[PDB]
């Protein structure tokens, strides 16, 4: 059984005559997040694509970091719209970045500034 | 001199970034053969250099996407009312119905486009945030005119802004105010025409095609023996001892290294081209969307009035709005006018001929007026100009002098 | 990286050529020698390619710098957001090691004020449009002012020109345009 990349993708077990699937398990690069050794030493580790305070991210599994529900402009980009920072003792937090504030404009058909 | 004027719109496609990639060196060249790694430890710097180059390309891609879009640090918001002087802005504004704020034309545009150490990284700015930026830009360029590109955002009614720009391209305001319904109808019809036209993008797809071809050629290159006895390292090691198999092993190693070198060079060149395109896109975004452009044939063919950015998968799409002349009319003219032995030149315009009378009119739209002293200024006598016509300039003060 | 690459044996028996030649005869040492030669050639090829690409990028940056120098320092630029954020007034080049540094000078607006406005003005059944500016509302009176800095003036015939009647404009306000000639007509 092959694919577009003409590499093995399936196989039939030759005793029970049933279909089996295959998948490699060697993905993932290792990355680390540091708020700067100038201030403190606590760090968090980020894996690239594997599935895993173990918190889960669209771009890997994050360990050593604490999730929050807020949103700010972010300091250290990570991936898939997730950013880490240090403001909080104090620790390392992750969240979804905020593109900025939001102000409506009082646009009326006779008002000028 | 033209007598009628239409309003057209035109698209323009630009790539912004390609697919971020990464290729681990050892996992590709070797499999699980430990001795293969031992041999590669004679070539150590090569893998580090290749990985560094790929990381550089990835960060360059993200930098392009960052530069081209986030031109504003204050996300604006369209008012709930749609009172824009009859301009049916409904095909490019976000719709609350869909989960993402992707507008209709963005949604239509987004659908037309369709193992061994080849991890693919995702961009650190998801498409929803890109659509958010685009919507913010649309709100800013619709309500706040264009001053929001310089400091704060200043509110101003849309009709007055269109009058501003019509003044910009060299026609008086009254032309716009006298034809609001016609202009709005033409604009809406043009928007609908674009909506139809896009319902049936080579520059945005050949990038993906080339990336697929490059990766496919890199993968398929594994099959070849590179002049060795067989492809798989496991078969070679299991059938021969190291003292005679090392030649086959290192020949394969050289083959894989050559393939990686070639692919990396191709990626670097393509990335340089993409960066050039992204810088052009940023310049167009900052000189068309904000303000008005006097650079002829830059922001769409013909005279330029405004623009509307739109997002696209790995791309960006502009909707320029261009004033264009129409049916004209023959006329007779002469530069100077001689009244009392002294010349007369128009302040703004030319001297078209009725065939019986004379007039002064705007340079781009037929508007006959009466030649007064408030439209011309005098300099020198009538004895030096190469061409001139006898006539009389009416004066406003004389009838009031009663 | 180019220098440190010398250390590696490139799959040969040792690094230094002198040791190889002093320990083996040419008929058996030539393979080690030419393997090393291939290694050094590959390293030089890679470094040269990297240098060429970096030089192309630097040339692009230098051409952009020349364009900025000729369009910001000399004259004024209407290309928005080219010579510094905001409106542009002048520039001042400065040198730097292997670089160049500009000091743009940008006019930027400040605190604003709400107002009411209407495009046209109807005086005697005929329209009135400003020559330069807009019609801001005192809340009691009307004025014409510059487009970028509040300067109220009195609406005369020297600030507006007429075209057509009052029966076609989409929005308009009743008012009276003072005339300079009438008081002097005494
Ligand atoms: C190969 O031998 C195995 C031995 O277990 C066979 O497995 C049989 O599977 C059926 C399926 O329900 C059972 O009912 C039998 O009890 C199993 N054993 C035997 C001895 O039949 C298997 O079927 C054999 N392969 C083929 C192709 O028949
Ligand atoms: C960071 O480095 C500066 C360099 O002088 C030093 O003064 C400062 O104390 C350092 N930060 C901390 C938290 O010590
Ligand atoms: C990660 O993979 C495991 C493997 O089955 C799966 O159970 C899990 O749901 C995956 N994680 C997510 C977030 O889908
Ligand atoms: C301006 O908007 C107000 C909203 O209440 C409306 O009553 C008025 O008719 C509008 N005027 C014009 C000229 O559109
Ligand atoms: C100009 O063209 C439009 C449509 O093409 C038409 O309705 C109109 O009568 C023409 N003339 C003028 C003066 O607008
Ligand atoms: C805009 O056009 C769409 C269809 O083209 C229509 O459904 C909608 O009512 C229009 N809105 C306005 C304000 O004209
Ligand atoms: C000149 O213009 C007048 C109106 O101002 C018009 O009545 C007359 O026919 C014109 N002469 C021509 C067209 O020869
Ligand atoms: C214009 O008027 C002057 C005044 O007499 C006359 O001399 C001249 O010939 C006239 N122009 C032409 C073209 O005849
Ligand atoms: C209108 O302007 C005059 C000065 O020209 C001022 O005295 C008056 O208070 C203004 N009306 C207002 C602010 O309602
Ligand atoms: C402006 O004056 C005319 C003259 O009578 C009048 O008919 C018109 O109604 C006035 N405008 C408004 C908005 O009332």
Residue numbers in the entry:
A (entry chain A): 566 to 617, 641 to 676, 689 to 713
B (entry chain B): 714 to 827, 855 to 940, 945 to 1146
C (entry chain A): 961 to 1146
Question: Mind quoting what the paper says about this structure?
Answer:
The SARS-CoV-2 spike glycoprotein is the major surface antigen of the virus. Its function is to bind the host receptor ACE2 and mediate the subsequent membrane fusion required for cell entry.
This feature is linked to the acquisition of a more basic substitution at the S1-S2 furin site (also observed for the variants of concern Delta, Kappa, and Omicron) which allows for near-complete cleavage. A substantial proportion of all other spike/ACE2 complexes are dissociated into monomers. For example, in our previous study of the furin-cleaved spike of the original Wuhan strain (Wuhan) complexed with ACE2, we observed that more than 70% of the particles present were monomeric S1-S2/ACE2 complexes. We also observed that the Alpha variant spike is almost fully cleaved into S1 and S2, which was not observed for the Wuhan spike. We have shown that the almost fully cleaved Alpha spike is more stable as a receptor-bound trimer than the Wuhan or Beta spikes which are subject to less efficient cleavage.
